[PDB]
Amino acid sequence: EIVLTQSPVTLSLSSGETGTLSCRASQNISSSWIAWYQQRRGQVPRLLISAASARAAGIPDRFTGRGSGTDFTLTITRLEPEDLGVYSCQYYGGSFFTFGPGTQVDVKRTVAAPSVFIFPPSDEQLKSGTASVVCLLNNFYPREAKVQWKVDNALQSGNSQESVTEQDSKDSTYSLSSTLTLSKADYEKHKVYACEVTHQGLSSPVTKSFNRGEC
């Protein structure tokens, strides 16, 4: 059971900066069986480095792999826009191959707190049997953000889905939508619907809320 971990979760760099991605093995492993892959958005993954440090053919000199034992690193120097994507380490020794969770490399910018909005269910949806409550986090940075739903101060779990836009090409920000799915019956039994947002750009978590029936 060889498990690879990676750090950081997201690496933010400006054009021309240098970044170092880390891969950590569960136990000692030989450098002969470690690889790094690059995946740009929408494209197929591509081999960058094999045997920990051997650069694949056609791969530019900006990428260099190093490491031994349990610590392996990939260094990107003179970062260029084509280098934006997800980088994953792989162990291909033994019988069962495994990949690291991947590290995202995105464009660096200053911190921006999200603008938070909450939308009640429309009446046209309530006459259909379901109720959707939507929470919008607009134009924030960094990517990391937490959203917690609360119905009459009761924390919700398992009944929400969220999706995130790609990093915007103009302002380098993200936007996030979280959707709470409720039945009409359960929606009509409660009043206060609150979306609580935690982000680096906020001194403290922000809560947007509405009362069912404009109360």
Partner: protein, 230 residues
């Protein structure tokens, strides 16, 4: 060089089984294992299994044991992946991969299982869903508040299948501040997304905001005016 060609996109019912094909173009056939790697939406790469064709050296990921089968058709020079008892956890893009190595390999007849993958197939999309074609229902996301003169409104495009749906605002005349989020598959096997836009709150009573929702596989076009509820 060496190239890999895969079969087309698949939509499978939960509990059924899927079969994907990978046909190498170039190089040899029995020297290098074909390794299958998949990617669920918004997740990392996951190794499924690998098999050296004909020679029959293979291993399956522990997560896929008693459920997966890798095999080949030697005459047609084609390898296959079979995954049974599909659940929504199996939805994603499936890649067949291998190591280019010695190409035609005139100096080697050995077989090799342990290698990185510098050759990748284009990927086969597998959607696990118990749903048929169905048009979306478009609901408004009404704005109301006393955010620095900027309000948000949008449209919730819910309960459709399959992908894709296209969304625009005011017949494409409104583009600034528009965020159309990636669709998400909900537990019912139907897609759902929202499209939001930030507008000056002072013009809510004057400007008309309509979202244009077009779902080609269902031949459905909807235009929903988003008004502040009062």
């Amino acid at each position: 060089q060496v190239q890999l060609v895969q079969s087309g996109a698949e939509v499978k019912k939960p509990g059924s089984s899927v079969t994907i094909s990978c046909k190498p173009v170039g190089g040899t056939f029995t020297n290098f294992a074909i390794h299958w790697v998949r990617q669920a939406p918004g997740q990392g790469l996951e190794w499924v299994g690998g098999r050296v064709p004909v020679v029959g050296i293979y291993k399956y990921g522990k997560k896929f044991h008693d459920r997966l089968r890798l095999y080949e058709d030697d005459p047609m020079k084609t390898v296959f992946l079979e995954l049974r008892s599909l659940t929504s956890d199996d939805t994603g893009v499936y890649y067949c991969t291998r190591w280019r190595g010695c190409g035609m390999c005139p100096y080697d007849t050995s077989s090799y299982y342990n290698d990185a993958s510098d050759v990748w197939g284009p990927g086969t999309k597998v959607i696990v869903s118990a749903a048929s074609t169905k048009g979306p229902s478009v609901f408004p996301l009404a704005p109301s508040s006393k955010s620095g003169g900027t309000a948000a409104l949008g449209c919730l495009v819910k309960d459709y299948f399959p992908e894709p749906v296209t969304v625009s605002w005011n017949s494409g005349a409104l583009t600034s501040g528009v965020h159309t989020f990636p669709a998400v598959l909900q537990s019912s096997g139907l897609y759902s997304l929202s499209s939001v836009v930030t507008v000056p709150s002072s013009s809510l009573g004057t400007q008309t905001y309509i979202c244009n929702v077009n779902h080609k596989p269902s031949n459905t076009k909807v235009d929903k005016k988003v008004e502040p509820k009062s």
